[PDB]
Write an enzyme that holds these catalytic residues in place. Structure first.
Site, PDB file in Angstrom:
ATOM      1  CD  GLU H   2      -9.180  -8.353  -5.759  1.00 27.40           C
ATOM      2  OE1 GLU H   2      -8.454  -8.736  -6.693  1.00 27.40           O
ATOM      3  OE2 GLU H   2     -10.370  -8.018  -5.934  1.00 27.40           O
ATOM      4  CG  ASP H   3      -4.563  -4.601  -8.161  1.00 28.81           C
ATOM      5  OD1 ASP H   3      -4.042  -5.733  -8.228  1.00 28.81           O
ATOM      6  OD2 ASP H   3      -5.188  -4.077  -9.112  1.00 28.81           O
ATOM      7  CB  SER H   4      -3.196  -3.887  -1.208  1.00 26.21           C
ATOM      8  OG  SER H   4      -2.788  -3.185  -0.065  1.00 26.21           O
TER       9      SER H   4
END
Ligand SMILES: [Mg+2]
Ligand SMILES: [Zn+2]
Ligand SMILES: [Zn+2]
Ligand SMILES: [Zn+2]
Lengths: 99, 79, 257, 64, 49, 115, 44, 132
Positions: H2-4
């Site tokens: 999740e966008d990390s």
RNA sequence: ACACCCAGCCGC
């Protein structure tokens, strides 16, 4: 006393669109400066980790801790009455690798 | 006999009864169940709920002013 | 004792490469040996900087950080020094430290490069490895850099300035017979260096009753240690860790029943 | 601001290899051959030397 | 006053932080930094055990 | 502000234990080894060396959290050979492995350097 | 403490009782020199 | 997920994305008024009744902190004792839970012509978990 | 050591 492992907290993200945006968790102390969630918990919060900040509230009365522990836990509050479907679910890598 | 309520202990009833019991045990109330190694009063409260030996009666307000006094022992728990 | 017998061969041996092949051992042993190359080999690097005066264009933490990454020769001396947290010294003693002094000052019109040659060590067994010189800061007229530095002995787990290697390359089973990576289109993938198959074939045929016992290494030294000594100290350090675990479990079993 | 002492990825020393690299640009060599004359085989160190800015030379212009 | 200081009021014992994932925690767990844990407190009542 | 000390990944303070043994009661003759302040480096080799032992029925390891520094090695053997003895045999076998490999590597250095 | 100038970089002597002025070039901006107490730096 | 981003710790140790954060705090001596002057001096607890439990010993003789001094959270970098119509402390503290070292201290005269001072505090920011 | 006003920016 200081907050230790196992303390019940309320954990909230704005905008607080529905009842799943405010659920209760148990605290685990980890040695860096961020709130770390489970991944599947990000779907009811409508969260991601592109810079989302997210709030923490701590009760200090055992009736309040009991009310969160028996009404607002993550596992107790998995299936929503919005759609009688589980609002939590396997997402991202764990979903594309189990396939 | 004048007991027109649900004979099932609701989740809010569980939450507040465990809360009141845990706070009372934290304020040194006698424990109605044997102890075998819990410190936190919440675990004692769950054990007393499962043993159905809690000293709590709850009053339910029907929406006309009339009340109904129920015992937590004579209610039906959710597990 | 259910332990096999690994063997070694050395392909070529320069001052920076110790390329070797290990045969007849598990994958886990080779991987942990690579991780001890990266992490668990002690060298000497600067860890205690005291800036007396710094009028350069670079601030003090930047100078200290670039001093920490300067490699120091530790060919034999690292095995005889101690850890500063495992000594009886108060703060720092020459039993576990080396002193460094830097008193550079520019008073010429041309720019002055503060190379690693200007670090005057105390014990003449450690030194910056370029003694092509590692510059720390450029200075103009009227700029000085006075500092005293202490270098300890530490692992690569604690910081990457104690990492002795420079990108160890670990390859096993080069012709992809044992299917541990599945090529979507095998013929477009280049053959690696240690490849036995010809140009016509793409990958070796599948071997059902097969385990990987062949491990190619390219352990490359940054300069702090000779590339002999990185491996010959990594194996010793892994042996020491396993012996510490052995004696700790012996003490645990003794006080068990 | 200045050339790093070590490559971020691998750890090879590239602090001492800036000036000579500039010399190989002053000796009318291409940048690829200049990198290959230094032993920077892996493309991490080629990223280090090829894509670096000497802003410290700009900072030295100002009075101390 | 009514909307901004009766329905919604600033509260003590509250924390705010950027979030990062953790696949090694259960779904009912949240990781908390040490400074937030040391700053925010829970008032326990001294029971005889 | 909340960074751990960089030496906490490999150092024991006063009070914590390097290795503990916890008998597992889900299945008979199984043990959990909670090795503290270490990482995958010993976990992988100990797991492989215990897997090589034919009288070991289960040999696995986990790191519960990368930000923490514990490894848990679970071992289950036959009801003839205690799991602590299996771990002891694995550690001394790996000592023999590393010692023999070190001697052969030193001979290889000498043979390459002599010509 | 004592101050140095921003133009000529020459040390000055003012102790909380003088108007801010360089003794030589008359510059109104003047800095304070680095402290004599030493601070530990982790090269980490 | 999740966008990390997973980051190399060894690279960050070797200078990857390491940076500093200069903050500057500005204070002037506003002697406007009858007797409401605030001279720069080190505030001792004898006079200057309004005080705090901050660490008041790193200041210099000029009512100022020196460059190169380690500064933790909630410290004092100015001594500004204003006369109560004996005196009281009107000095600035650091931002809450900030850290750093004093880089430069400027003493000058501002547009109004008063004793104007600026402090620059430099803190290195190694890339932690949670940095975008 | 504030209180308004204004601006910019973060997450959805
Ligand atoms: Mg977001
Ligand atoms: Zn010592
Ligand atoms: Zn590189
Ligand atoms: Zn002057």
């Amino acid at each position: 006393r200081h907050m230790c492992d196992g303390d019940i907290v309320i954990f909230n993200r704005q905008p607080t669109l529905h009842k799943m945006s405010m659920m209760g968790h148990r605290v685990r102390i980890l040695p860096w400066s961020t709130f770390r969630l489970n991944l599947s918990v990000t779907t009811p919060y409508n969260a991601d980790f592109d810079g989302d900040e997210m709030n923490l509230h701590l009760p200090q009365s055992l009736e309040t801790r009991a009310e969160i522990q028996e009404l607002a836990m993550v596992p107790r509050m998995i299936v929503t009455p919005q759609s009688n479907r589980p609002v939590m679910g396997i997402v991202q890598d764990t979903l594309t690798a189990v396939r | 006999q004048k007991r027109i309520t649900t004979p099932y202990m609701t989740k809010y009833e569980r939450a507040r009864v465990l809360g009141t019991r845990a706070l009372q045990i934290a304020m040194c109330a006698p424990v109605m169940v044997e102890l075998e190694g819990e410190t936190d009063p919440l675990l004692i409260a769950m054990k007393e709920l499962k043993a159905r030996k809690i000293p709590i009666i709850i009053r339910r307000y029907l929406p006309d002013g009339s009340y109904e006094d129920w015992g937590v022992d004579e209610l039906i728990i959710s597990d | 004792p259910y332990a096999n017998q690994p063997t070694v061969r050395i392909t070529e041996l320069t001052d920076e490469n110790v390329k070797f092949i290990i045969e007849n051992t598990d994958l886990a042993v080779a991987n942990s040996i690579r991780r001890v190359f990266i992490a668990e080999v002690p060298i000497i690097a600067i860890d205690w900087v005291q800036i007396d005066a710094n009028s350069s264009v670079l601030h003090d933490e930047f100078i200290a950080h670039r001093l920490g990454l300067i490699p120091l020769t530790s060919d034999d001396i690292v095995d005889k020094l101690q850890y500063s947290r495992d000594c009886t010294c108060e703060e720092f003693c020459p039993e576990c430290s080396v002193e460094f002094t830097l008193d550079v000052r520019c008073n010429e019109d041309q720019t002055r490069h503060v190379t690693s040659r200007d670090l005057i060590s105390n014990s003449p067994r450690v030194i910056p490895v370029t003694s092509d010189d590692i510059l720390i800061v450029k200075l103009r007229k009227g700029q000085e850099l006075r500092l005293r530095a202490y270098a300890k002995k530490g692992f690569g787990k604690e910081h990457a300035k104690w990492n002795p290697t420079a990108g160890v390359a670990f390859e096993y089973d080069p012709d992809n017979a044992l299917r541990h990576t599945v090529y979507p289109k095998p013929e477009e993938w280049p053959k690696s260096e240690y490849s036995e198959l010809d140009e016509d074939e793409s990958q070796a045929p599948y071997d059902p009753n097969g385990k990987p016992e062949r491990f190619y290494y390219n352990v490359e030294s940054c300069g702090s240690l000779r590339p002999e000594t990185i491996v010959l100290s990594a194996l010793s350090g892994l042996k020491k860790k396993l012996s510490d675990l052995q004696t700790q479990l012996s003490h645990e079993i003794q006080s068990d029943v | 601001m200045i050339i790093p002492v070590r490559c971020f990825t691998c750890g090879k020393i590239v602090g001492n290899k800036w000036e000579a690299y500039l010399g190989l640009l002053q000796a009318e060599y291409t940048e690829g051959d200049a990198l290959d004359a230094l032993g920077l085989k892996r493309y991490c160190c080629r990223r280090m030397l090829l894509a670096h800015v000497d802003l410290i030379e700009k900072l030295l212009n100002y009075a101390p | 006053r009514v909307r901004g200081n009766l329905m919604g009021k600033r509260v003590d014992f509250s924390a705010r932080t950027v979030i990062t994932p953790d696949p090694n925690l259960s779904i009912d767990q949240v990781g908390v930094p040490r400074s937030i844990a040391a700053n925010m407190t829970f008032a326990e009542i001294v029971t005889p055990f | 502000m909340n960074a751990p000390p960089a030496f906490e990944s490999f150092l024991l303070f006063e009070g914590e234990k390097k290795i503990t043994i916890n008998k597992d009661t889900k299945v008979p003759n199984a043990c959990l080894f909670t090795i503290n302040k270490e990482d995958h480096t010993l976990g992988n080799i100990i797991k492989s060396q215990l897997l090589k032992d034919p009288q070991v029925l289960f040999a696995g390891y986990k790191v519960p959290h990368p930000l923490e520094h514990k490894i848990i090695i679970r071992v289950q053997t036959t009801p003839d050979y205690s799991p602590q003895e299996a771990f002891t045999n694995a550690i001394t076998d790996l000592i023999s492995e590393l010692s023999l490999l070190e001697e052969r590597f030193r001979v290889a250095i000498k043979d390459k350097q002599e010509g | 403490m004592i101050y140095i100038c921003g133009e000529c970089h020459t040390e000055n002597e003012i102790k909380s009782r003088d108007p801010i002025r360089c003794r030589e070039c008359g510059y109104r901006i003047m800095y304070k020199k680095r402290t004599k107490r030493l601070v530990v730096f982790d090269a980490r | 997920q999740e966008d990390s981003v997973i980051m190399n710790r060894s690279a960050v140790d070797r200078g990857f994305f390491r940076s500093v954060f200069y903050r500057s705090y500005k204070e002037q001596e506003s002697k406007k008024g009858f007797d409401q002057e605030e001279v720069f001096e080190k505030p001792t607890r004898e006079t200057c009744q309004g005080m705090r439990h901050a660490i008041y010993d790193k200041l210099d003789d000029d009512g100022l902190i020196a460059p190169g001094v380690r500064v933790s959270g909630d410290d004092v970098i100015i001594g500004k004792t204003v006369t109560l119509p004996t005196k009281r402390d009107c000095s600035t503290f650091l931002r809450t839970s900030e850290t750093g070292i004093v880089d430069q201290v400027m003493v000058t005269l501002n547009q109004e012509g008063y004793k104007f001072c600026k402090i620059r505090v430099r803190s290195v920011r190694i890339p932690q978990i949670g940095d975008k």
